[PDB]
Design an enzyme around this catalytic site. Structure first.
Site, PDB file in Angstrom:
ATOM      1  N   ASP A 211      33.686 112.319  68.357  1.00  0.00           N
ATOM      2  CA  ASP A 211      35.057 112.198  68.651  1.00  0.00           C
ATOM      3  C   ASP A 211      35.588 114.021  69.132  1.00  0.00           C
ATOM      4  O   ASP A 211      34.842 114.635  69.531  1.00  0.00           O
ATOM      5  CB  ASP A 211      35.852 112.108  67.583  1.00  0.00           C
ATOM      6  CG  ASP A 211      36.994 111.121  67.820  1.00  0.00           C
ATOM      7  OD1 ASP A 211      36.761 110.013  67.838  1.00  0.00           O
ATOM      8  OD2 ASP A 211      38.262 111.601  68.138  1.00  0.00           O
TER       9      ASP A 211
ATOM     10  N   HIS B 293      43.239 113.404  66.477  1.00  0.00           N
ATOM     11  CA  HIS B 293      42.600 112.112  66.576  1.00  0.00           C
ATOM     12  C   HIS B 293      41.274 112.112  65.537  1.00  0.00           C
ATOM     13  O   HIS B 293      41.098 111.295  64.529  1.00  0.00           O
ATOM     14  CB  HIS B 293      42.207 111.898  67.847  1.00  0.00           C
ATOM     15  CG  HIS B 293      41.633 110.346  68.017  1.00  0.00           C
ATOM     16  ND1 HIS B 293      40.112 110.376  68.032  1.00  0.00           N
ATOM     17  CD2 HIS B 293      42.032 109.183  68.353  1.00  0.00           C
ATOM     18  CE1 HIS B 293      39.925 109.090  68.270  1.00  0.00           C
ATOM     19  NE2 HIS B 293      41.069 108.476  68.180  1.00  0.00           N
TER      20      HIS B 293
ATOM     21  N   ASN C 293      41.651  99.285  73.712  1.00  0.00           N
ATOM     22  CA  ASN C 293      43.206  99.196  73.126  1.00  0.00           C
ATOM     23  C   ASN C 293      43.783  98.344  74.787  1.00  0.00           C
ATOM     24  O   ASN C 293      44.665  98.470  75.017  1.00  0.00           O
ATOM     25  CB  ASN C 293      43.747 100.443  72.718  1.00  0.00           C
ATOM     26  CG  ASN C 293      43.371 100.887  71.334  1.00  0.00           C
ATOM     27  OD1 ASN C 293      42.669 100.296  70.735  1.00  0.00           O
ATOM     28  ND2 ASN C 293      44.192 101.979  70.948  1.00  0.00           N
TER      29      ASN C 293
ATOM     30  N   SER D 160      40.537 101.998  67.369  1.00  0.00           N
ATOM     31  CA  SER D 160      40.303 103.336  66.945  1.00  0.00           C
ATOM     32  C   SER D 160      40.489 103.467  65.318  1.00  0.00           C
ATOM     33  O   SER D 160      39.644 103.864  64.770  1.00  0.00           O
ATOM     34  CB  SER D 160      40.792 104.200  67.512  1.00  0.00           C
ATOM     35  OG  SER D 160      40.431 104.749  69.117  1.00  0.00           O
TER      36      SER D 160
END
Ligand SMILES: [Ca+2]
Ligand SMILES: [Ca+2]
Lengths: 279, 10
Positions: free
Chosen positions: A39, A69, A161, A224
């Site tokens: 990430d 995030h 998403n 996520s």
């Protein structure tokens, strides 16, 4: 062991019904397993990690999370208050920039880096990979995740998403990794969550409270916040000895709570990750 | 994917 007043999705993972508030888990808490969070990076200095989190690779000038995030995701996996696997070891691989984007070639490279890195990392109970990332369909991206799974890493990936079929999204559509959709407080599929026959399991992905950059916390929604929940369930389950990297996704589905979810499209599994720990 | 908390794979 019992964590009282636990974030909703933690308690939901150790319960057969919704509306519970206590998180039940074995005190082994995923010790001996390692989870690579691919990430934006991880704020390793967050006290919620207790010296258990660590930056292992960047494809950028900085190995830090300047987004937040990655830190949030890594906290649902293994932070002390927000984590499923409260004693697991966390490894950061920065394939996403501070905005939270990355090219396909660099995220394929980061998957391939773990394949090799894990051999020289002390993870006696096994190695898991959490990928709360994705985009348009890519056969190289699906290939890379297949190799990663094939190297002996339990690979959990986000469904997307988009509220559409996950079949048109890159690592998601790789049939061999564990593809994770999101659910809410009321046992409904989250509105934004993708579906499709490619999903294997659902995890809590709506209003998920976790760690954030700056030694702080934050609550956010998405496939996520759902991925790392099943990623930490694997590491915890693997550290229990119940399953291993190769069989993990199958075992989690076979032991999931079934038929509890509403708003589940036809052709999509109605399974919600569950740790099977009644006291 | 990335930035601030959110999610992806699509
Ligand atoms: Ca699968
Ligand atoms: Ca459950």
């Amino acid at each position: 062991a019992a964590q009282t007043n636990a974030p909703w999705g933690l308690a939901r993972i150790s319960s057969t019904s919704p509306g519970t508030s206590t998180y039940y888990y074995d005190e082994s808490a995923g010790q001996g397993s390692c989870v690579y969070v691919i990430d934006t990076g991880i704020e390793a200095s967050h006290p919620e990690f207790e010296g258990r989190a660590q930056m292992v690779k960047t494809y950028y000038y900085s190995s830090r999370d300047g987004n937040g995030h990655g830190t949030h995701c890594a906290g649902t996996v293994g932070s002390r208050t927000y984590g499923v696997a409260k004693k697991t070891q966390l490894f950061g691989v920065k394939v996403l920039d501070d905005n939270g984007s990355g090219q396909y070639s660099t995220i394929i490279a980061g998957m391939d880096f773990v394949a090799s890195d894990k051999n020289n990392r002390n993870c006696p109970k096994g190695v898991v990979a959490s990928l709360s990332l994705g985009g348009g369909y890519s056969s190289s991206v699906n290939s890379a995740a297949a190799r990663l799974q094939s190297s002996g890493v339990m690979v959990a990936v986000a469904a997307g998403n988009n509220n559409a079929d996950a079949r048109n999204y890159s690592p998601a559509s790789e049939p061999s990794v564990c593809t994770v959709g999101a659910s809410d407080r009321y046992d409904r599929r989250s509105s934004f969550s993708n579906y499709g026959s490619v999903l294997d399991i659902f995890g809590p992905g709506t209003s998920i409270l976790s760690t954030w950059i700056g030694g702080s916390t934050r609550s956010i929604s998405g496939t996520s916040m759902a991925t790392p929940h099943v990623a930490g369930l694997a590491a915890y389950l693997m550290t229990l000895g119940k399953t291993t990297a190769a069989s993990a996704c199958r075992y989690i589905a076979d032991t999931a709570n079934k038929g509890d979810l509403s708003n589940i499209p036809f052709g999509t599994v109605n399974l919600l990750a569950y740790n099977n720990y009644q006291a | 994917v990335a930035q601030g908390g959110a999610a992806g794979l699509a």
